[PDB]
Ligand binder design. Structure first.
Ligand SMILES: O=P([O-])([O-])O[C@@H]1[C@H](O[C@H]2O[C@H](CO)[C@@H](O)[C@H](O)[C@@H]2O)[C@H](O)[C@@H](O)[C@H](O)[C@H]1O[C@H]1O[C@H](CO)[C@@H](O)[C@H](O)[C@@H]1O
Ligand SMILES: O=P([O-])([O-])O[C@H]1[C@H](O)[C@@H](O)[C@H](O)[C@@H](O)[C@H]1O[C@H]1O[C@H](CO)[C@@H](O)[C@H](O)[C@@H]1O
Ligand SMILES: [Ca+2]
Ligand SMILES: [Ca+2]
Lengths: 133, 132
């Protein structure tokens, strides 16, 4: 049958969903909602994944991704796969603050999509991924 | 056939050195295997180590499905248990806390063994899947 659950979007080996009804939540609560679906906050390893994920988002909203600071700019993916500084999509001037331990993706007008470090406790939208069948 | 076209049978698994896909990072290599319904090789025996290395070029290094999730906390990409007593590290390996991804390569007059290297370095790779 289908490689993805109903209403999930296929790209590469993964299935993606923006949980629309789940209202804005903290990074921990967003990861927990992904987890309830057998998924994780998105783990963005490539330009192709950054482009696909941002293609299914609303340019007017900011979305938590599965990247967090375990120390002092020691970025870790929620699935613990390697973080590669050379393949990142930080907005200009980001990351900005050792007090901002979670990461969102949002659209800057006349620039495009990029990552921003933010307070883990701020409520944001999110995007989930899982392996396909 | 137990295995897809161009894949090689050993035990309950099919193995492939990807060709259309040139040298790549550990993450890109793992995604390339996953797109084929496969994963980077997970090595649970001497026989698997020998079969996998048997189908490689002694002049190249190949990513395997082993990486450090923290501080010498080695994990297989299929979540099967890491057993330090059934490993094939080269002498002096794993060498460095900043080398988080594992390659298998040939040392002249020694043979094949594992080396921790930087995850960002481009290497060849080997994929594994269950047979049909
Ligand atoms: O504009 P707000 O109030 O949302 O946030 C303030 C600005 O930072 C934001 O924008 C920059 C990009 O210009 C990002 O790097 C940053 O992550 C924020 O999204 C100001 O530029 C910044 O100097 C200021 O500190 C920041 O305040 C917010 O963040 C603080 C730390 O999380 C909170 O204590 C504060 O209440 C507020 O939420
Ligand atoms: O430039 P290289 O020789 O290919 O790699 C070196 C590496 O950058 C440096 O940090 C090491 O001190 C040096 O020995 C080289 O390391 C390679 O070889 C050792 C084994 O001899 C491996 O353990 C390393 O993972 C590198 O492959
Ligand atoms: Ca910031
Ligand atoms: Ca090494």
């Amino acid at each position: 049958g289908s490689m993805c659950p109903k209403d999930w979007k296929l790209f590469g080996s993964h299935c993606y969903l923006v949980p629309t009804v789940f209202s804005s939540a903290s990074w921990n609560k967003s990861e927990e909602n992904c987890s309830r679906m057998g998924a994780h906050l998105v783990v963005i390893h490539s330009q192709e994944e950054q482009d696909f994920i941002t293609g299914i988002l609303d340019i007017h909203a900011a979305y938590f991704i599965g990247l967090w600071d375990t120390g002092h700019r020691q970025w870790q993916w929620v699935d613990q796969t390697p973080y590669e500084e050379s393949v990142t999509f930080w907005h200009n001037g980001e990351p900005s603050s050792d007090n901002e331990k979670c990461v969102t993706v949002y659209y800057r007008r006349n620039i495009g999509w990029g990552w921003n470090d933010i307070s883990c406790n701020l409520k944001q939208k999110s995007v989930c991924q899982m392996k396909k069948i």
